[PDB]
Amino acid sequence: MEMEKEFEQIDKSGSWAAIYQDIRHEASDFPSRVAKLPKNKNRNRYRDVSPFDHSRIKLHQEDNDYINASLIKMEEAQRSYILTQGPLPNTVGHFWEMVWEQKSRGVVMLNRVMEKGSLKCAQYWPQKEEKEMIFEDTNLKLTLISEDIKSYYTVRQLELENLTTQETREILHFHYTTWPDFGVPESPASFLNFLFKVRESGSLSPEHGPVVVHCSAGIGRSGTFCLADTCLLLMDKRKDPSSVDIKKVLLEMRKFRMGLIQTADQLRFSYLAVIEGAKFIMGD
Numbered sequence: 001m002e003m004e005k006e007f008e009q010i011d012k013s014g015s016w017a018a019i020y021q022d023i024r025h026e027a028s029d030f031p032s033r034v035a036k037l038p039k040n041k042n043r044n045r046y047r048d049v050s051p052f053d054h055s056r057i058k059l060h061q062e063d064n065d066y067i068n069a070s071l072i073k074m075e076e077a078q079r080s081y082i083l084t085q086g087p088l089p090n091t092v093g094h095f096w097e098m099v100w101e102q103k104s105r106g107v108v109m110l111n112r113v114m115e116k117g118s119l120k121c122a123q124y125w126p127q128k129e130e131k132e133m134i135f136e137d138t139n140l141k142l143t144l145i146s147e148d149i150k151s152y153y154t155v156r157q158l159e160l161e162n163l164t165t166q167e168t169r170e171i172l173h174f175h176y177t178t179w180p181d182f183g184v185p186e187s188p189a190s191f192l193n194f195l196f197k198v199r200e201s202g203s204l205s206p207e208h209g210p211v212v213v214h215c216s217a218g219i220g221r222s223g224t225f226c227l228a229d230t231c232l233l234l235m236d237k238r239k240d241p242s243s244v245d246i247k248k249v250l251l252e253m254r255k256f257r258m259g260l261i262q263t264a265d266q267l268r269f270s271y272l273a274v275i276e277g278a279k280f281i282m283g284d
């Protein structure tokens with residue numbers, strides 16, 4: 001069923017809450033035993049948001065390999081994403097260890113450091129060129145190279161150095177700065193423009209490790225970003241673009257991380273983004 005007609009049918013019938021609860025009921029339940037070990041309590045921002053054991057990213061260290069992060073591998077679309085929480089004061093070194101070990105080119109941030117008067121993630125990148133950051137626990141150095149501030153997003157060039165080997169890599173930081181404190185954007189136009197800037201950078205391409213994507217918990221806004229990207233790529237690849245079922249793609253992604261798309265409003269917004277993005281890249 002053409003999702004644009006499915007969309008109008010749900011709107012006219014006001015059944016977004018009912019559709020969303022059906023997804024919640026059908027979603028996968030896999031163990032998260034490593035996340036719940038007592039040694040890992042200060043590595044989790046939220047007690048109810050944990051990576052599954054089967055899809056969790058492992059740090060390359062013998063001490064404690066745990067980070068709150070999941071590999072979402074989309075087989076038909078040929079895209080992979082790492083979805084992670086906003087870094088905590090004691091996990092900023094782990095965060096950049098993961099970027100280095102997974103060979104990521106891009107970090108996508110969908111939150112502000114402060115929202116609703118509370119801290120939603122650590123200040124984990126340098127704000128001035130001449131004041132670099134050293135992460136002594138993981139032996140990394142991070143330098144701000146350049147910053148480009150736009151009305152709806154900021155792009156930063158960062159240099160990450162492995163102090164053990166003196167190898168260096170360019171990381172691109174894509175920061176969507178205008179998601180409102182409550183609810184979802186009225187139009188998906190700025191969010192789609194942002195998704196197209198990340199694509200144009202190479203950060204989502206198979207010559208690199210998976211893109212790292214986060215918000216505060218790494219399931220809601222982060223879920224909307226990967227769901228919209230994957231649905232648009234499938235509409236390009238298939239003979240019948242109308243065969244793409246957004247609810248089925250979301251359930252596939254929920255096999256790899258719990259709770260992706262946190263509200264019926266986020267579900268409606270994901271539908272709007274895919275419908276408007278399809279008719280921009282193409283039409284109909």
Ligand SMILES: Nc1ccccc1N1CCOCC1
Pocket residue numbers: 088089090092122123124133134135136
């Ligand atoms: N410790 C900390 C907590 C919250 C955010 C950033 C950091 N930085 C780590 C590396 O040295 C500069 C500060």
Ligand SMILES: Nc1ccccc1N1CCOCC1
Pocket residue numbers: 145157158159160168169170171
């Ligand atoms: N200059 C450099 C040398 C060797 C590896 C990577 C880089 N980067 C290029 C873009 O700015 C961030 C760092």
